[PDB]
């Protein structure tokens, strides 16, 4: 999966996800999957979403991952009293703001593009929209 090979810190606070997103336009490929809803994508959701599109396109073209977890999440198991120290990291998520270019694709037709991202978007928790590279 996708996760920081090294971090200056192991744990991190809650961190609220407010405001819009930065990456809204595609600057690597001709197409790509854009986000519309609000939430967070885990390493599993991202990886699983990659396999879908990457599989729907056989072994041609190229895909990019504009997003990245880089955010540890701690959780406490069952039969555990509150407190007693912060929980332990179980997985890493990535804050996705409305307009975050999730993935991108290039080297394949426009029709095959939607189909690819269509099977990948179904893996994503939040809604998404298909976008095409625009000039300026």
């Amino acid at each position: 999966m996708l996760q920081p090979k090294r971090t200056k810190f192991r744990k991190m606070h809650k961190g609220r996800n407010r405001g819009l997103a930065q990456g809204t336009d595609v600057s690597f490929g001709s197409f790509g999957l854009k986000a519309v809803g609000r939430g967070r994508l885990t390493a599993r959701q991202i990886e699983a979403a990659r396999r879908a599109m990457t599989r729907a396109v056989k072994r041609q073209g190229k895909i990019w991952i504009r997003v990245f977890p880089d955010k540890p999440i701690t959780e406490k198991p069952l039969a555990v009293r509150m407190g007693k120290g912060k929980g332990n990291v179980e997985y890493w998520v990535a804050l996705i703001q409305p307009g975050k270019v999730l993935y991108e694709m290039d080297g394949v037709p426009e029709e095959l593009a939607r189909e690819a991202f269509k099977l990948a978007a179904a893996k994503l928790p939040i809604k998404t929209t298909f976008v095409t590279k625009t000039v300026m």
Partner: protein, 94 residues
């Protein structure tokens, strides 16, 4: 080439800008040369279809405001956070 009917704005600020986006309109500005900037309010739909063409960002544009054709050029454009709409476009006198 691309004729874009425009009208000088009567009030600036995000407050007025928002009221424009709630009526199929969006804020704009034409700067450049020795002339002073001019607030402009272009139609959403109209410009929404004109920007769809790559020739809109390449070829020169002709904005008609108060009976005046100013040959400008698309400098920059701000698109909606996630919807296929426009927020503001900057034009340069050329």
């Amino acid at each position: 080439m691309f004729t874009i009917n425009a009208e000088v704005r009567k009030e600036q600020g995000k407050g007025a800008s928002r009221r424009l986006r709630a009526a199929n309109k969006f804020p704009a500005i034409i700067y450049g040369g020795k002339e002073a900037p001019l607030a402009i309010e272009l139609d959403h739909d109209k410009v929404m279809n004109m920007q769809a063409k790559a020739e809109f960002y390449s070829e020169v544009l002709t904005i008609v405001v108060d009976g005046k054709e100013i040959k400008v050029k698309a400098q920059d454009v701000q698109r909606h956070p996630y919807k296929p709409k426009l927020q503001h476009i900057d034009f340069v006198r050329a």
